[PDB]
């Protein structure tokens, strides 16, 4: 910014775009420093009641892998339902 | 002292804290290499700007190599360098008497003050290096002056080892490169057509390893070892051999020395490191002395390495693209002269 109008007009034209509206250099639009102090929210599990960990510890309630076909009519089954075709976009199908 | 712990490589300790005043030198570079490899504490007094001693930094490990600013005329600088060293090695030498330093200074004057302080400090041992065949009467001022020193330093520092190496063979050496660089000169003058000046080169490393071994051995005290080599040579084969590996024509033409000492005087006048020296010339045609003396290599623990073996590496830079790939086997060897 701080550009004489003519330079701006030359700029906008040569570029073909209103570069003034979206300048790259930042001027007094960037968040001021020393933004106010933050009081962040405490999440769940901070209840002082009905908060038993045994009821909220997925870490080791996990079990050893389930085993099928261990070494020690029927229809065909796929790894999973065949995938669904993606659909062309509607805002900008092409380009 | 420092009990030696470790497996033997870098990042290990050997317990040798050693001031080495002329480390930047061709021999020096090698001395710091082994000392650093072994894990010894090395203090390198330097005068040239830091840029030039960078090559020494990677050698040795962190906090194992310490560089101190030092001036030969200023006695105080030598004083603080040896403050905390227990081994002092002196490699101060030059071939061209410089405007502000005379052969006496570089060989006898300075190397005295140094050992003198070393004693005041209480260094266990001092190793002083002087050129081989150095009579107090030898023709070259250099050799004679060096002889003068080996005497003096003994009075400043008694029982100070005095290794006395021959001209050294190694990459970046003069003995081998000088002759090879005679290429620029269309003709390669050789006094007496390169005869009657049998010479015995010695690989730099051998010299270095020897020197280092001295530092870590009680057997050497007041010893004047002479690292010599694995084979002698009449200067003729040496010159041609060199030109042989360099793959450049060899044109031995005799030149009366009386006139040649003058050529040395000429380049000697050069402001920027004269390439040849009147004192050099004499030295080059100064015959290598015979080997009857406190032995050096082998005696100190390293078996000498023949010249032909590593010559290929020293003389390779002087070849042309055409011969670069050529190898030692293709080339012929020179002949020794037990004489």
């Amino acid at each position: 910014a701080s550009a004489t109008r003519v330079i701006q007009k030359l700029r906008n034209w040569a570029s073909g775009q209103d570069l003034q509206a979206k300048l790259q250099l930042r001027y007094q639009e960037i968040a001021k420093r020393t933004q106010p102090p933050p009081k962040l929210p405490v999440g769940p599990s901070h209840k002082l009641s009905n908060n038993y960990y045994c009821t909220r510890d997925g870490r080791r309630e996990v079990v050893p892998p389930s085993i099928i076909m261990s070494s020690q009519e029927k229809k065909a089954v796929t790894p999973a339902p065949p995938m669904k075709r993606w659909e062309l976009s509607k805002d900008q199908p092409y380009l | 002292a420092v009990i030696p712990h470790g497996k033997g490589g870098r990042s290990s300790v050997s317990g040798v804290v050693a001031t080495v005043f002329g480390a930047t030198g061709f021999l020096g570079r090698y001395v710091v290499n082994h000392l650093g490899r072994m894990g010894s504490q090395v203090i390198i007094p330097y005068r040239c700007d830091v840029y030039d001693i960078m090559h020494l930094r990677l050698m040795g490990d962190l906090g194992q190599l310490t560089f101190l600013e030092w001036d030969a005329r200023d006695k105080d600088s030598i004083r603080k360098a040896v403050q905390h060293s227990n081994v002092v090695i002196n490699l101060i030498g030059r071939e061209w008497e410089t405007r502000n330093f005379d052969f006496e200074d570089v060989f006898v004057n300075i190397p005295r003050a140094i050992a003198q302080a070393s004693k005041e400090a209480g260094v266990e041992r001092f190793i002083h290096v002087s050129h081989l065949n150095a009579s107090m009467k030898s023709s070259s001022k250099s050799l004679r002056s060096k002889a003068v020193g080996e005497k003096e330093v003994r009075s400043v520092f008694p029982e100070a080892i005095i290794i006395r190496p021959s001209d050294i063979f190694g990459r970046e050496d003069r003995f081998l490169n000088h002759f090879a660089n005679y290429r620029w000169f269309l003709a390669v003058p050789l006094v007496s057509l390169g005869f009657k000046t049998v010479k015995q080169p010695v690989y730099v490393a051998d010299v270095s390893k020897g020197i280092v071994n001295a530092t870590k051995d009680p057997d050497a005290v007041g010893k004047t070892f002479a690292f010599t080599g694995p084979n002698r040579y009449l200067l003729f084969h040496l010159v041609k051999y060199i030109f042989g590996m360099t793959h450049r024509t060899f044109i031995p033409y005799p030149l009366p020395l009386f006139v040649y000492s003058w050529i040395g005087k000429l380049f000697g006048l050069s402001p920027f490191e004269p390439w040849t020296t009147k004192d050099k010339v004499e030295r080059i045609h100064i015959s290598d002395v015979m080997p009857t003396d406190l032995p050096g290599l082998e005696d100190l623990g390293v078996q000498p390495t023949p010249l032909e073996l590593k010559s290929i590496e020293v003389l390779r830079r002087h070849r042309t693209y055409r011969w670069l790939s050529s190898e030692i086997e293709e080339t012929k060897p020179a002949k020794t002269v037990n004489y």
Binding site: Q17, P36, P38, K39 | -
Partner: protein
Amino acid sequence: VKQDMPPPGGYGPIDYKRNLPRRGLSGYSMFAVGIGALIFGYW
């Protein structure tokens, strides 16, 4: 309480699609310019 969050009502809308402008002189008209220069220049 005070945490960094979208302003009430949400932020405004941001453009992502290419906005390259097809701005130029039509081809026939263009040819004429150069051709005219040559035609006149030759005369």
